Write a protein that binds this ligand. Structure first.
Ligand SMILES: Nc1nc2c(ncn2[C@@H]2O[C@H](CO)[C@@H](O[P@@](=O)(S)OC[C@H]3O[C@@H](n4cnc5c(N)ncnc54)[C@H](O)[C@@H]3OP(=O)(O)S)[C@H]2O)c(=O)[nH]1
Length: 140
């Protein structure tokens, strides 16, 4: 049920993200295959039509808590592309679980007690969007 949509990244973007994870000595890094950015997180399903663009060129580190109560480190971006794709889903009827869509790439879903801050230049190039059912229990 529901609908989840995310974007996957080009090889060069993935390399840069992994370099970022290594630079930060991040615990529980998201594995390469699981790096993504959510576009839709909807409890209702709509006929969202999935999509060489750089979609973002920088981001800031932000800590978000997860459902399980762990601390996740994300690279939070301003992305006109991702925000417009999120709004397309909304126009179709999709729901979202936060008051603001804040596009991000989760770098670790469990950073323990550590703290991080920074502003990075990362060329974020999308390879493809994918859609599937909403998996409330998804993990990396
Ligand atoms: N305060 C605040 N927190 C925010 C804000 N935006 C987000 N967060 C939180 O940040 C967490 C760390 O990412 C996060 O924790 P979750 O326990 S709900 O993570 C579960 C995660 O599974 C991912 N996933 C992969 N595939 C599927 C699938 N098929 N269905 C469902 N999920 C899927 C997905 O990536 C997703 O996280 P996401 O953040 O991309 S929506 C959020 O709750 C905000 O605006 N504000």
């Amino acid at each position: 049920s529901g609908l989840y949509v995310a974007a996957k990244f080009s090889e060069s973007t993935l390399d840069a993200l992994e370099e970022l994870q290594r630079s930060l000595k991040l615990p529980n890094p998201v594995p390469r295959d699981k790096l993504h950015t959510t576009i839709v997180y909807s409890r209702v399903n709509v006929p969202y039509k999935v999509a060489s663009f750089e979609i973002a060129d920088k981001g800031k580190l932000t800590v978000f808590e997860t459902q399980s109560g762990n601390r996740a480190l994300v690279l939070e971006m301003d992305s006109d592309y991702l925000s417009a794709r999120h709004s397309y889903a909304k126009a179709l009827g999709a729901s979202y679980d936060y008051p603001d869509y804040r596009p991000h790439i989760t770098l670790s879903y469990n950073i323990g007690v550590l703290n991080f801050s920074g502003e990075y230049k990362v060329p974020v190039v999308l390879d493809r969007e994918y859609s599937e059912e909403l998996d409330l229990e998804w993990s990396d």
